[PDB]
Amino acid sequence: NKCDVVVVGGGISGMAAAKLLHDSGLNVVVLEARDRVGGRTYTLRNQKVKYVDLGGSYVGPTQNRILRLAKELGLETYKVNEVERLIHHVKGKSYPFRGPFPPVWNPITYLDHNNFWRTMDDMGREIPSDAPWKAPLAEEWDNMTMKELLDKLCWTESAKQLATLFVNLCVTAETHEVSALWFLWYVKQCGGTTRIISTTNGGQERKFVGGSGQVSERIMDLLGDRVKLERPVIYIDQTRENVLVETLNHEMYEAKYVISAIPPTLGMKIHFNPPLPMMRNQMITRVPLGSVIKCIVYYKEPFWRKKDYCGTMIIDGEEAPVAYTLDDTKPEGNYAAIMGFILAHKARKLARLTKEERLKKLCELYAKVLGSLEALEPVHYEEKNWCEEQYSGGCYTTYFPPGILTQYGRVLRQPVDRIYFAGTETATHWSGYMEGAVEAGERAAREILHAMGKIPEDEIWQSEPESVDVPAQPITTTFLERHLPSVPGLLRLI
Amino acid sequence: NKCDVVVVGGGISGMAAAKLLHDSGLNVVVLEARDRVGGRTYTLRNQKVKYVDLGGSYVGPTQNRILRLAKELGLETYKVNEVERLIHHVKGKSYPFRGPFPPVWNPITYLDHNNFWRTMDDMGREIPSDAPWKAPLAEEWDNMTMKELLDKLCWTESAKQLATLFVNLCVTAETHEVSALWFLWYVKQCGGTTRIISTTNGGQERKFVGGSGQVSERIMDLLGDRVKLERPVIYIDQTRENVLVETLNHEMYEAKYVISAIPPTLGMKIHFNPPLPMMRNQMITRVPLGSVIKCIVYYKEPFWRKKDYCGTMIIDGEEAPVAYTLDDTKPEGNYAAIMGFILAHKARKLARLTKEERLKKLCELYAKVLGSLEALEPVHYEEKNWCEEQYSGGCYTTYFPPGILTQYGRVLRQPVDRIYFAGTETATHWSGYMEGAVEAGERAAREILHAMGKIPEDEIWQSEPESVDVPAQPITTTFLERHLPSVPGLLRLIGLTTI
Ligand SMILES: *Cc1cc2c(cc1C)nc1c(=O)[nH]c(=O)nc-1n2C[C@H](O)[C@H](O)[C@H](O)COP(=O)(O)OP(=O)(O)OC[C@H]1O[C@@H](n2cnc3c(N)ncnc32)[C@H](O)[C@@H]1O
Ligand SMILES: *Cc1cc2c(cc1C)nc1c(=O)[nH]c(=O)nc-1n2C[C@H](O)[C@H](O)[C@H](O)COP(=O)(O)OP(=O)(O)OC[C@H]1O[C@@H](n2cnc3c(N)ncnc32)[C@H](O)[C@@H]1O
Ligand SMILES: NCc1ccc([N+](=O)[O-])cc1
Ligand SMILES: NCc1ccc([N+](=O)[O-])cc1
């Protein structure tokens, strides 16, 4: 029944908010729709895999909040294998390489690739992390898809194919589905292209020993009986002195304040009294999540390492079910595995198959790309299609179709009376990630502390000390990278 | 508690489904979220206006199902005033005209305008009404916005400006928001550009005497206590023998079958057990409704008619709050009024103002467009912002952003076990309209009758006899319209003789 704050949603963001409020001495209740916490993180345990992250998994330098929270909970990280060579597979052939970016030899193609990445970052510098709709060319960029941008920018099919894969991998959506403004903001707020795509020194550097699901589980342990599982919220009534929150099983909860820590569009599952203001009412019908199947194929050994391949594959083309893989082998060197993402329209297309059929397709792809018959002899398989999840809507995160961010973006984290908005979608740094989940949860919790007169306005947004365990190397460019001309620039010079 | 079919939603589609089922001898219940039926139709009555439609209103030739349903309920139509001249207001000046299309004098601009409309219809012919995703270039067209299509097609700012206004008016959304495939389908399934934009001989030809909301009200009267108001559905459980439907006030309903007659995205407000299949799960988060404020300004007399203006204004330009108006005077000639739409981004922008501030802006616009100081002397004002409606989501209808119709379109009316899908969005002829609501409601009811073994598969989709009261003139083109070149075609012809 009665408490200080009801938190709707027990993913990382809701759990982080609840923990903060609880630690401050308030009485909190977390209402969670599922029979588990973790949300878009989910760690499966069985004897075959020991543990595997079927949802959110990777953390890296500059993600200091998730690192701090996890460390406090007694968790440790290990490094994703990137010792040996990466592979770029293009037009049916594998090209091994080192460093974050797949190399390019054709000079014209080199100029075009260089200019594409550079231009993404140039554009991003004009986009405020906390208010992308304030970009000088906000409307122009918002009224275009990433597909139109790429069509204008890329003078080679090669650069355009890699740019397209980059978009599909980053936001699990097609270039024609997403706003140019939103995508450029998305990249910028993760620290730029190099940081977002990198394993070593970027977002995919590390995983948690034992799985990321332990973050939400261990907070649930701390909160004890304050977490209510299988309590989908159906109704929020703000017409009276105390906020009334009702669940599907008819339980009633009364609080001074509410934190909505669910994906924005999942706000649609709640009936509001009084109705939401017009802008939020429409916003929450305009913001879908992307489409992905996360697939993990297990092998007797990490055989790719013997051929001086780390297990990272960047795989061009329509025929490939999976466009990106990483080595998912345990730090001990056992439970050898390849993690792959089936992205965007392929998730939709390949979902029609059976589990066994998808396994076979992945193994045949990997055998080709790795040039290894050993890829054809899997010992186990796990996968999760996030498109089927009623209480997620997709993965990894919410994307903004053209026109939406400029028109509706400002209401995303705008409080509605006594409802404050957490969830990774509301973060300003690594929004879309576990890191942004923590930022948003703790910020929403502190907005409530301030509303209660407990802290100054000054302390709502709080900086994070850099992790000593995962230090960040700065992102550098070369003189030639900075100053080499684009394709049209070379033509203007001619 | 127990019945044959629960219908979720008491708008025209749900009411049409419920009526058909009831007439066939089944026990039906309608569960309606609001304290009223009608949904996206709403007829306000007070002494100042007598009655006024604040939501859906116009019907016209080829909309035979809504016409038949309304006639059977004892309703009559009247013709929207189009006796005098229409006005096209462009770059601060008004140009009166007759006929559906605003005329163009510059022969280059003339070629461009002609080619634009022609091309919309050309492309539409390639799109099946019942399966737009089967169009030969479906993916190509779906992966483009209407803005990109317009940028490629229109060689003049003049054609591009009018085309933009046409999209905004038709689907209450910006050109950059909507799929080109979806918009081309949407126009084609209303019978094409001429039919959709026309008053005389098109969609805006007529209104119902007394308001469109009488359609839903009169069906409610027929069904009696079977319509439950203020019963928003929160939960549908299909795990057992009978389907279980729960409302917000905790009432339980058990049925053999369910019809969902709500806007597709509003399916999100229901928790499903078992969960929806993956495609529908994601589809319902991908399909927003448009943005509109419908505004009616009342005057002492229909003074525009004295100046040989019928009251239709097509008003281009960012500064104009309202891009389209029609005369909304009663057929008796009293309660003189102008209806105008505030569309898409302007609905969002101008919603920040007060009602009094919006009235002032509209009057000042109308005075300018009509060249009439009388427009500054309104006697009354009514308006409705459909963006604020929890149980509509917007108006007039659902639009599809780029990429969505080809990926998700096929599940829109695909049954989910014992749930069948009605609502205007699922129609194949005049989807988006009251007409499409009737088609979809009755088709969904018959899908259930067929499932029950009561009718053959053959009878699920049923043709409609043409109205005798509202006959449809065919859509014609001229020889020149058909064969005049586009701008680039003229240029190709020039480059050819220069060799
Ligand atoms: C799915 C996924 C995500 C992911 C990714 C790969 C996949 C396949 N890889 C990631 C990675 O490597 N590194 C990273 O940092 N992030 C990665 N992502 C995304 C990441 O998992 C998410 O950003 C993060 O988990 C989001 O957290 P948040 O707390 O903001 O949101 P959530 O996990 O969805 O939690 C919401 C909870 O709310 C419950 N819910 C939903 N509706 C209700 C109602 N009505 N009532 C009560 N509770 C509700 C959900 O069940 C959920 O638990
Ligand atoms: C808003 C609008 C619409 C409109 C238009 C102008 C405006 C401003 N002009 C039109 C016109 O001139 N001619 C025409 O034919 N159509 C026009 N439109 C669109 C038209 O009104 C709609 O196409 C039509 O009314 C749609 O009917 P349909 O039956 O398909 O859908 P609905 O009216 O939205 O009814 C849905 C009902 O469901 C209830 N609801 C919603 N959620 C729930 C839940 N969870 N549980 C129970 N009931 C629910 C809604 O309250 C509604 O009554
Ligand atoms: N959520 C996992 C993930 C996200 C982004 C990239 N990337 O390369 O941009 C790789 C992997
Ligand atoms: N829903 C009203 C309406 C719809 C479409 C048009 N049009 O011109 O295409 C006019 C008015």
UniProtKB/Swiss-Prot annotation, chain B:
Stated consequence of mutating C363S: Complete loss of activity
Keyword Membrane in annotation: yes
Keyword vocabulary terms for this entry: Acetylation, FAD, Flavoprotein, Membrane, Mitochondrion, Mitochondrion outer membrane, Oxidoreductase, Transmembrane, Transmembrane helix
Result when mutating I197F: Alters specificity towards synthetic inhibitors
Marked site (Important for catalytic activity) residue numbers: C154, C363, H380
Subcellular location: Mitochondrion outer membrane
Membrane topology recorded in Swiss-Prot or TrEMBL: Single-pass type IV membrane protein
Positions on the Cytoplasmic side per record topology: 1-487
GO molecular function terms noted in the UniProt entry: electron transfer activity; flavin adenine dinucleotide binding; monoamine oxidase activity; primary methylamine oxidase activity
Positions where S-8alpha-FAD cysteine occurs in the chain: C395
Cofactors that this protein relies on: FAD
Classification via InterPro entries: Amino_oxidase (IPR002937), FAD/NAD-bd_sf (IPR036188), Flavin_amine_oxidase (IPR001613), Flavin_MAO (IPR050703)
One GO process term, biological-process aspect: substantia nigra development
Domain of life from the UniProt record: Eukaryota
Primary enzyme class: oxidoreductase
Assembly with partners or alone: Monomer, homo- or heterodimer (containing two subunits of similar size). Each subunit contains a covalently bound flavin. Enzymatically active as monomer.
Family indicated by similarity: Belongs to the flavin monoamine oxidase family.
Biological function: Catalyzes the oxidative deamination of primary and some secondary amines such as neurotransmitters, and exogenous amines including the tertiary amine, neurotoxin 1-methyl-4-phenyl-1,2,3,6-tetrahydropyridine (MPTP), with concomitant reduction of oxygen to hydrogen peroxide and participates in the metabolism of neuroactive and vasoactive amines in the central nervous system and peripheral tissues. Preferentially degrades benzylamine and phenylethylamine.
Name of the featured protein: Amine oxidase [flavin-containing] B
Source species: Homo sapiens (Human)
Lineage of origin: Eukaryota, Metazoa, Chordata, Craniata, Vertebrata
